[PDB]
């Protein structure tokens, strides 16, 4: 629930002008620059690499769900919401009583002579894509942009910008309108759901309430999300289904998204506005595509492994488009499970062939689509469009205690273990690999006793010049 | 569709009085006013210009769309197209009914001495719009037709006036696909279904211009429009001669007013004969009569106040114009094109003025399949301007999304990235990484920079002492 009371700003635009719902939301440069700028990351000191193999197992299985980077496709995605919402807006003023009458009225004002010029001046979409493309996660920090809920005292209007509609797995569209009273609920503090969303009523009765309290708490927009679930035996068929869709459209009356896989595409061929959420492309323009590069980068730094490689080759990136092929959970779940793997065995550093056990074995269920995508062709792609890894939540866990029922000790772990600030651990995992850990570790110790006043940043050229010297 | 119960009013004119589709027309001067006056764009703030770059190129990439300079073509375009509007209907006033008939009885006057003086005479008048692509006839078409209601319902005559329809051309077009486009534009603006009755694949051109000249009558239309004739493919159409029959029969079969508009090699089509009159709708020229011609003055003023540049160059220099108009020839949209793209050029390279090597850069890296038109209108060879006069540039919408996401990208780096490509070496990457945590990266990278600089083939081991030397204090 997120209420905010209503700031009214001037706009430079005739339509909007003087509709307070469209003025009360953020501008429209905010929600284009909050795209690129809100993002989401770990806190990783390196006091978090000295630590335990459970700790840094744990802080490494988090990555998967607080981890955002923002790439080009969320701002093309920020934009059209944007241009939804205030679209949809533009028909609902509540003081510009009738658009065909001012048409007339201005028509007549220019035949007496009143007005010297005058203009006769004169939504749905679909977005489409693989599982594990990153549909979800964008549409919620797209919608954090926003305020769910804008209250107006100059009248008694409870705006809900966004609501978002989940499918139910095996779903049927009986549950969508109940889910909407649901989800309004939990959005705006009512309770919709004992009255209106009862079994006696039929889908007509709450299409009808559907579009009465959405225009009663004026919807920018209606998100339905995951309609891969939805069962096509249960709801009826494609047609029905879309039939369903294209109706709910009309009686609501507010812009409306509908996100889902390739396969789910199959539903509205005999028809949407559709944008499509593609996996992430290493080369572009017959280039090699930055945001790849960077993205790799900036998950790069989220490494907790003790002697891991700190610059990415090109080979172990290449392979990981190879294995992922830009769909982005099994990047980061490639990721993260080669971490985890690394953990158990030793050897922690992230090699290609590492990645490709990863990939061989606790990937399997999503190989099918994955060679879709590398054969380009379109029906096999929309085949395993829905195909997703299950229980990995569960597999984290067992490999997580994989690495817990490890006994042995790598040589790194041990040198930490004889050293005893977190300062020191630091200097040495600074140049643990430059230099022989036997020799390493009792200078640092002995420099770091002789001098306590003297600052860590001073402390290592002494400890340089003493190992050179 | 705009549909309009008419309000009918008093034209100063005799020929005009008493006509319903000339007096539910709005008034010729507010017409001409409306397309003139109106000049509706961006309204930009000091606070703009210091906002963040990824806002500032979205109000950027929007001027292309969003600004409109009336210039004289233009203002004569809208002149013509009310008087050709009102002109057509003069004719095909309701009242003036069996005009024949009228001849007959004032010629039996005459002949009985009743009347003392009468004429015996038997106005669809023609236009041709020439001008190179890019030289803003569709958007200047689109607003001389929006100061016009579409449809104008008479609920005395129960008849529904159409003023303008508007029929666009194909890429590979044949004569076929105009008249069958006649129907289907006309479908979207009346309720009418034309095109599911009448106007099939079926019936012959010969037919359907019969079946355009009744159904044009029945609602009166004002002025039929057809517009991009380059497209229309010469070898799918039958050739030069039997295009140029189609629209002189499509003029004299219907007796509506035509605009056809089209690049200077479409002028060949119509070249045998001078029919049809002739507007040329020029490139904006340098110098009028050796002297500075100050719509380009105008044009190019106005159009860089709309410029998002923090260290803007305060007024635009003669040297940036004339380059400008180098590059551009004066063809408008090369000009507001070379403008916004130099300006996102300006902020990816993170600098914020507008050099004429920016412009020069942005017209060689970007506007390439333009060069030859461009260059040919330098000559001032006719006949090589005309054989370039149909290229456009494509898929710069696309162009400005990349630029604008670019410049989003640096935007949002992380002061890691731009440290790690600002270094040119794995060893001074390596040894950011390293001192990243406990060193600022003020000193961080141009230290490592100069060290690997003064000391090329040297280890990463030996180096990291002089490195932190430096930052300590040191030379
Ligand atoms: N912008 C991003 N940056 C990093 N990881 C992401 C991003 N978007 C998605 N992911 C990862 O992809 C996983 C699945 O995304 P999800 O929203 O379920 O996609 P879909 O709905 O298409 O299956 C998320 O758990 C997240 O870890
Ligand atoms: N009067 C004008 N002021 C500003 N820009 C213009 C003007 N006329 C045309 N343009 C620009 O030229 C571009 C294309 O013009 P267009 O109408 O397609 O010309 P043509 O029909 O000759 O190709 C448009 O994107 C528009 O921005
Ligand atoms: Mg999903
Ligand atoms: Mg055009």
């Not at 001037?10 to 700028?37: C, H, K, M």
């Not at 978090?48 to 193999?53: A, F, P, V």
């Amino acid at each position: 629930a997120t209420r905010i009371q209503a700031v009214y700003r001037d706009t430079g635009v005739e339509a909007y002008r003087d509709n307070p719902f469209i003025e009360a939301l953020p501008p429209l440069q905010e929600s284009v620059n909050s795209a690129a700028s809100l993002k989401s990351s770990l806190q990783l000191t390196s006091s978090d690499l000295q630590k335990s193999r459970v700790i840094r197992a744990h802080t490494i299985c988090r990555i998967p769900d607080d981890y955002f980077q923002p790439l080009g496709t969320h701002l093309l995605l920020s934009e059209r919401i944007s241009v939804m919402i205030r679209g949809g807006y533009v028909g609902r003023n509540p003081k510009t009583g009738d658009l065909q009458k001012h048409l007339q009225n201005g028509y007549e004002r220019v035949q007496t002579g009143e007005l010297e010029t005058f203009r006769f001046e004169e939504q749905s979409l679909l977005l489409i894509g693989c599982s594990g493309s990153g549909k979800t996660t964008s549409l919620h920090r797209i919608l954090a942009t926003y305020p769910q809920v804008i209250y107006h005292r100059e009248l008694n209007v409870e705006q809900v910008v966004y609501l978002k509609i989940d499918c139910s797995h095996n779903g049927s569209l009986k549950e969508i309108c109940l889910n909407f009273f649901r989800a309004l609920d939990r959005a705006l503090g009512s309770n919709y759901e004992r009255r209106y969303g009862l079994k006696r009523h039929g889908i007509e009765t709450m299409l009808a309430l559907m579009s009465q309290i959405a225009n009663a708490h004026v919807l920018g927009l209606l998100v339905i999300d995951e309609i891969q679930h939805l069962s096509r035996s249960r709801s009826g068929g494609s047609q029905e289904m879309l039939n369903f869709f294209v109706t709910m459209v009309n009686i609501i009356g507010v812009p409306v998204m509908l996100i889902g896989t390739p396969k789910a595409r199959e539903i509205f061929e005999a028809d949407f506005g559709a944008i499509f959420w593609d996996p992430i492309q290493q080369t572009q323009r017959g280039k090699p595509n930055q945001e790849w590069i960077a993205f790799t980068d900036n998950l790069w730094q989220l490494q907790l492994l003790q002697r891991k490689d700190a610059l990415l080759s090109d080979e172990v990136r290449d392979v990981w488009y190879e294995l992922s092929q830009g769909v982005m959970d099994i990047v980061v779940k490639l990721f993260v499970l080669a971490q985890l793997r690394a953990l158990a065995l030793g050897n922690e550093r992230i090699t290609a062939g590492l990645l490709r056990q990863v990939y061989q074995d606790e990937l399997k269920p999503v190989h099918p689509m994955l060679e879709a995508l590398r054969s380009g062709i379109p029906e096999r792609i929309a085949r395993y469009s829905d195909l997703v890894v299950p229980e990995i939540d569960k597999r984290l866990i067992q490999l997580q205690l994989d690495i817990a029922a490890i006994q042995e000790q790598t040589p790194e772990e041990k040198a930490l273990q004889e050293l005893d600030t977190e300062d020191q651990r630091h200097l040495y995992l600074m140049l643990k690999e430059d230099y022989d850990s036997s020799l390493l570790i009792p200078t640092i110790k002995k420099a770091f006793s002789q001098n306590p006043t003297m600052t860590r940043q001073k402390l290592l050229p002494l400890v340089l010049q003493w190992l050179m010297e």
